[PDB]
């Protein structure tokens, strides 16, 4: 697993792309699991309403689209992976994986990443 490794590998700081982003604290090998997109799998029919709720309470909403019927809501139970910004020439990608029966969104490195480099991936 990697729940341990991740805190030592990545960190959250300001990003020239937008807002805060996830940056690399130590070199990450191409192929390496960088981090999980922690959250709860909700049915994508509920993203509209949940987002209404969060916007009304001034909570920042973080959601990751698994597919056309499930998204991972990271607003309340996420982790640092919700700050990963988008790029069309990224250095990461999402993959849905299955561990003992549970879905998981895990971020992998496309190339080797170097200290201080923002981590990105393609949204759509």
């Amino acid at each position: 697993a990697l729940a341990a490794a991740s805190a030592a590998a990545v960190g959250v700081y300001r990003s020239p792309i937008h807002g805060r982003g996830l940056f690399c604290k130590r070199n990450i090998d191409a192929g390496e699991m960088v981090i999980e997109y922690a959250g709860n799998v909700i049915r994508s029919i509920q993203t509209d309403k949940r987002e209404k709720y969060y916007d009304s309470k001034g909570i920042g909403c973080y959601m990751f689209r698994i597919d056309d019927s499930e998204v991972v809501d990271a607003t309340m139970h996420g982790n640092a992976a919700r700050f990963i910004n988008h790029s069309c020439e990224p250095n990461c990608y999402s993959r849905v994986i299955n561990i003992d029966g549970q879905k998981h969104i895990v971020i992998f490195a496309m190339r080797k990443i170097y200290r201080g480099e923002e981590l990105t991936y393609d949204y759509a």
Partner: peptide, 4 residues
Amino acid sequence: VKRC
């Protein structure tokens, strides 16, 4: 991917 985010905010949807």
